[PDB]
């Protein structure tokens, strides 16, 4: 702010002001609020809580069976070298 | 300004006036502080007709 003498800035907005209204009042709000609809315990989703496999491992079962059977052919006898 | 304006002619004139507030460029006696109010100045001019 600058004040300049001799033209000085009025020393106030004075008493000639026009009170325009008495509408100043905010009427307090008084209220009762009830949000009470029956609630049912459940919601349907496509899927909740699953941690789906991105790849599975290979998996398997097992079997064996049979017996011990055989047809054989042997090497001929040979002269013994030494000993 | 043309010394004479003959019948049917149009003359062109130029005039300058200095309206002083301050006495001179170095003597500010009479100068006006105008940055101190919103109140307006009035420079009234009445021209020839």
């Amino acid at each position: 702010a600058l004040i300049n003498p001799q033209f000085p800035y009025a020393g106030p907005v004075p008493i000639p002001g026009p009170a325009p209204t008495e509408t100043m009042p905010l009427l307090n709000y008084r209220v009762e609020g009830r949000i009470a609809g029956i609630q049912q315990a459940r919601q349907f989703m496509p899927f909740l809580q699953g941690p789906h496999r991105a790849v599975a491992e290979q998996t398997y079962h097992a079997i064996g069976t049979g017996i011990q059977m055989g047809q054989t052919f042997n090497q001929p006898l040979i002269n013994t070298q030494e000993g | 300004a043309p010394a004479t304006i003959a019948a049917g002619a149009t003359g062109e004139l130029t005039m300058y006036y200095w309206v002083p507030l301050a006495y001179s460029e170095t003597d500010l006696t009479g100068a006006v502080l105008a940055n101190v109010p919103q109140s307006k100045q009035r420079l009234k001019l009445e021209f020839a007709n």
Side-chain angles (χ1 to χ4, degrees), chain A residues 9-70:
Chain A
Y9 294 96
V13 44
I15 308 172
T21 305
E22 289 178 19
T23 305
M24 289 174 180
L26 290 64
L27 294 64
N28 290 3
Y29 295 96
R30 292 181 175 180
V31 52
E32 289 181 19
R34 296 179 175 180
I35 298 176
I38 299 175
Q39 301 180 25
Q40 303 180 25
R42 296 180 175 180
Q43 299 181 25
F44 297 84
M45 285 175 180
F47 300 83
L48 294 63
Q49 308 175 25
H52 298 283
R53 296 180 175 180
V55 48
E57 286 181 19
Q58 298 181 25
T59 306
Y60 299 95
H61 293 284
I63 303 174
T65 314
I67 303 172
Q68 299 180 25
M69 286 174 180

